[PDB]
Amino acid sequence: NLPNMLRDLRDAFSRVKTFFNLLLKESLLEDFKGYLGCQALSEMIQFYLEEVMPQAENQDPDIKAHVNSLGENLKTLRLRLRRFLPCENKSKAVEQVKNAFNKLQEKGIYKAMSEFDIFINYIEAYMTMKIR
Amino acid sequence: NLPNMLRDLRDAFSRVKTFFNLLLKESLLEDFKGYLGCQALSEMIQFYLEEVMPQAENQDPDIKAHVNSLGENLKTLRLRLRRFLPCENKSKAVEQVKNAFNKLQEKGIYKAMSEFDIFINYIEAYMTMKIR
């Protein structure tokens, strides 16, 4: 259920908020729910875990305990959405290709080049997927 | 039309192919047309432009001219799909937030932290977008 998924994050925040024109404008919400929704959320999660919360723990170290619990719940949330967050995921099939390619060595070059028309056919397949 | 979009890439390849168990398995096609379709295509384009074609121009430098034309048509194709390739795109709204945040300096930290519940509300909004 989306409430009880976000509730721990909400309880950690009710602790952080006592130590504290929107910055997080409505435009940010509109991109969260469009074409780029996943790229937007994923970079917003990384900007808070990477840039905002560390900066905040250093301006006032009395916040460390709660900010570190809020960052831990947001990494957990981030981990669950990777079931919701396509853009944080990589293709196992592409990983297979690259490991086969690298184990084949000089022969790999030959093969991946020789098959470029098969790759042109798979691309037309993706763009046709999306024509739908 | 998807044929005439891919035709230059096809004509450059009919030049390259005269200097030359699939490596580009059907599993790769299945990921091109699923959840991860865009991450898969995007990394496959980068693996050919970055790893395969340079390796191929060095094993046999007589191929340079045609391989360099095939790489140029695939970068152009890649440029057109960014209208088709969501995962290569970044959120202008997230860029705005970060530039506002950095121009605000110490006040930016305060503000982005104080607004974390607004961010928790936008996230529930994305996961509800996707519940649909």
Contacts with A100 from chain B: Cβ below 8 Å: 23
DSSP H helical ranges for B1-132: 2-16, 26-32, 37-47, 53-59, 64-81, 92-104, 106-114, 116-129
Measured CA to CA, the distance from residue A55 to residue A47 in angstroms comes to 11
CA distance A31 to chain B (A): 7
Residues 79-108 on B with a CB inside 8 Å of A are 81, 84, 86-87, 89-94, 96-98, 100-101, 104, 106, 108
Give the domain extent around A66: 1-132
Contact indicator for A119, B13 with CB cutoff of 8 Å = no
Instruction: Please provide the distance, in angstroms rounded to a whole number, between the alpha carbons at the two ends of chain B.
Output: 31
Q: In Å, what is the CA distance from B62 to each residue of A100, B12, B42?
A: 26, 15, 28
Q: Flag whether residue B132 sits within 8 Å of chain A, measured between CB atoms.
A: no
Contact B32/A129, CB-based, under 8 Å? Answer: yes
- Sign for the CA dihedral angle at A80, A50, B126, B30 comes to negative
Measured CA to CA, the distance from residue B116 to residue B129 in angstroms comes to 20
Q: In Å, what is the CA distance from B16 to each residue of A114, B55, B72, B111?
A: 8, 14, 13, 56
A106 Cβ contact list (under 8 Å, min separation 6): B59
Show the tokens assigned to B33. Answer: 């047309």
**Length reported for chain B:** 132
Measured CA to CA, the distance from residue A85 to residue B78 in angstroms comes to 23
Residues in chain B after which the backbone breaks (C–N beyond 2.5 Å): 20, 83
Task: Return the closest-CA partner of residue B35 out of A37, A124, A89, A45.
Answer: A89
Contact A25/B118, CB-based, under 8 Å? Answer: no
Contact A16/B116, CB-based, under 8 Å? Answer: yes
Measured CA to CA, the distance from residue B73 to residue A123 in angstroms comes to 13
CA distance B123 to chain A (A): 7
Measured CA to CA, the distance from residue B68 to residue B96 in angstroms comes to 37
Instruction: Give the other-Cβ count within 10 Å of A122's Cβ.
Output: 21
Total number of domains constituting chain B: 1
- Solved with: X-ray
- 3-class DSSP assignment, residue A1: coil
Task: Return the closest-CA partner of residue B50 out of B85, B21, B74.
Answer: B74
CA distance A97 to chain B (A): 6
Measured CA to CA, the distance from residue A131 to residue B68 in angstroms comes to 29
Q: Flag whether residue A6 sits within 8 Å of chain B, measured between CB atoms.
A: yes
Q: In Å, what is the CA distance from B104 to each residue of B108, B111, B113?
A: 5, 9, 13
Measured CA to CA, the distance from residue B48 to residue B21 in angstroms comes to 19
Show the tokens assigned to A33. Answer: 């729910």
CA distance A58 to chain B (A): 10
DSSP B43-60: HHHHHIIIIIHHHHHHH-
Name the residue facing B93 among A27, A47, A111 (closest C-beta). A27
CA atoms within 13 Å, Cβ hemisphere of B131: 9
Output b/e per residue, A21-39; b: 16+ Cβ within 10 A. eebbeeebbbbbbeebbbb
For residue A5, give the CATH number of its domain.
1.20.1250.10
Q: Flag whether residue B37 sits within 8 Å of chain A, measured between CB atoms.
A: yes
Show the tokens assigned to A113. Answer: 């080049």
Contact indicator for A64, A78 with CB cutoff of 8 Å = no
Q: Cα angle at A27 between B117 and A38, to 5 degrees?
A: 75
How much is the CA Rg of chain A, to the nearest whole Å? 21
B63 Cβ contact list (under 8 Å, min separation 6): B16, B19, B56, B57
Task: Return the closest-CA partner of residue A44 out of B54, B96, B88.
Answer: B96
Q: What is the resolution of the experimental data for this entry, in Å? A: 2.0
Measured CA to CA, the distance from residue A105 to residue B51 in angstroms comes to 12
DSSP A21-49: --SS-HHHHHHHTSTTHHHHHHHHHHHII
Instruction: Give the other-Cβ count within 10 Å of A106's Cβ.
Output: 9
Query: Residue A78 — left, alpha, or beta (φ > 0 → left; ψ -120 to 50 → alpha)?
Result: alpha
Contact A37/B109, CB-based, under 8 Å? Answer: no
Query: Residue A66 — left, alpha, or beta (φ > 0 → left; ψ -120 to 50 → alpha)?
Result: alpha
